[PDB]
């Protein structure tokens with residue numbers, strides 16, 4: 001888990017090979033690509049309450065709002081099963097109505 | 099005997115120079131260890147949460 | 149050793165190649181130093197810059213970002229650090245990386261980590277609003293992200309007070 | 319043979335805002351090497367013979 005210890009990226013595994021007076025590691029790493037642009041918001045008001053995402057992040061393509069995992073685009077509808085509530089939408093800076 | 103005196107000077111300064119070089123080598127080893135530590139710290143605490 | 153004398157040189161001749169061996173080590177030391185600096189600082193592929201308008205949810209980095217006013221473009225803290233700290237056949241070689249370049253590396257690193265987070269160390273930098281980066285960083289250590297959003301102002305003021313205190317202490 | 323000033327790298331200004339994020343949509347897998355010495359030849363030198 002420690003960053004850049006073995007492989008520049010997210011580590012998956014490694015393989016050893018011998019060499020006359022030393023060792024050679026082959027590091028297998030995961031690297032993301034093909035970015036995109038979206039509009040975000042830290043929380044969602046609903047009925048006064050303020051929902052936050054369990055694991056993921058809120059995004060929008062301009063018209064609708066979705067929750068995705070952070071490291072790979074995969075939109076999903078926002079349901080009560082992937083969000084949790086804490087308080088009312090009056091102290092957070094950046095809530096959006098939905 | 100001038101060459102004898104020159105020989106004395108030469109060996110003395112040779113010893114001094116060699117001692118200087120050896121101290122430099124030891125200190126360089128210390129600094130290299132510290133630099134490796136710094137690189138690790140800066141790659142693991144700056145570029146990500148530890 | 150000889151101080152520009154011929155007979156001394158002739159006498160020194162019969163000692164073999166001590167001086168080649170000696171001078172072969174100092175070169176290794178110098179190359180080692182340059183490699184040390186390069187591998188410590190040159191951790192990034194590109195050079196990032198911060199946007200002109202700066203609204204990081206209330207956090208105040210003015211003491212840390214470089215100041216264009218000074219010629220060296222070093223920040224206030226770097227300037228304090230630089231202010232505080234203090235031939236006969238020997239030579240001192242200049243380092244390969246001048247201090248301005250080192251400052252540029254530090255500025256690139258710091259702008260990247262302000263804007264992108266950790267993502268710029270793995271692939272390409274991805275922008276992320278600073279508040280919901282601190283939210284992820286709380287979520288990293290166990291505290292849910294709710295806490296940050298409900299105490300943003302206090303957290304920002306505490307950070308600013310801490311940075312001012314460190315400024316005065318230095 | 320030319321002499322010039324070293325270039326630290328490229329120059330990009332990441333488009334920071336306060337309500338915009340970037341999310342990757344694809345991935346790649348990279349295999350890279352790393353070489354580390356672990357040993358050197360064992361050598362013995364006699365005093366008297368030398």
Ligand SMILES: *[C@@H]1O[C@H](CO)[C@@H](O[C@@H]2O[C@H](CO)[C@@H](O)[C@H](O)[C@H]2NC(C)=O)[C@H](O)[C@H]1NC(C)=O
Nearest residue numbers: 037038059060061062063064065066075076077
């Ligand atoms: C944003 O994404 C949503 C989700 O797919 C899009 O809404 C759908 O768009 C398709 C396009 O033909 C329609 O067939 C669907 O009926 C839409 N969904 C619903 C529930 O009506 C939306 O078009 C996207 N908008 C932008 C600007 O990308």
Ligand SMILES: *[C@@H]1O[C@H](CO)[C@@H](O[C@@H]2O[C@H](CO)[C@@H](O)[C@H](O)[C@H]2NC(C)=O)[C@H](O)[C@H]1NC(C)=O
Nearest residue numbers: 040041042093094095203205277279335336337
């Ligand atoms: C993101 O930044 C924009 C920058 O303008 C903020 O927009 C300002 O919002 C306040 C209060 O909502 C208004 O009084 C200002 O007039 C807005 N600016 C302009 C130019 O109109 C926005 O509030 C910020 N949002 C978040 C979540 O930080």
Ligand SMILES: *[C@@H]1O[C@H](CO)[C@@H](O[C@@H]2O[C@H](CO)[C@@H](O)[C@H](O)[C@H]2NC(C)=O)[C@H](O)[C@H]1NC(C)=O
Nearest residue numbers: 044045046047048049089090094095096097098
């Ligand atoms: C989200 O919806 C709530 C209620 O539907 C809005 O709250 C009202 O906003 C109007 C316009 O600013 C005020 O006159 C009312 O006093 C607010 N409260 C109520 C109970 O109506 C809120 O403005 C919406 N959010 C946004 C960003 O428009």
Ligand SMILES: *[C@@H]1O[C@H](CO)[C@@H](O[C@@H]2O[C@H](CO)[C@@H](O)[C@H](O)[C@H]2NC(C)=O)[C@H](O)[C@H]1NC(C)=O
Nearest residue numbers: 202203204206207208209210211224308312315
């Ligand atoms: C961030 O903190 C600095 C303090 O170092 C603020 O700079 C001060 O700004 C006030 C008015 O804006 C001036 O009266 C002071 O003289 C400034 N101090 C220095 C040392 O220059 C800066 O304004 C803060 N940032 C924001 C956005 O408020």
Ligand SMILES: *[C@@H]1O[C@H](CO)[C@@H](O[C@@H]2O[C@H](CO)[C@@H](O)[C@H](O)[C@H]2NC(C)=O)[C@H](O)[C@H]1NC(C)=O
Nearest residue numbers: 031032033034035072073342343344345346347
């Ligand atoms: C993710 O990237 C891979 C690698 O480029 C894409 O797979 C390529 O697709 C093109 C178009 O069909 C082919 O010509 C290449 O041969 C494919 N590469 C390999 C290694 O098979 C893939 O399409 C991308 N995913 C998405 C959703 O765009």
Ligand SMILES: *[C@@H]1O[C@H](CO)[C@@H](O)[C@H](O)[C@H]1NC(C)=O
Nearest residue numbers: 035036037038332333338340
């Ligand atoms: C997002 O939009 C900005 C401004 O239009 C642009 O500079 C940036 O390149 C876009 N992001 C990506 C990943 O292209």
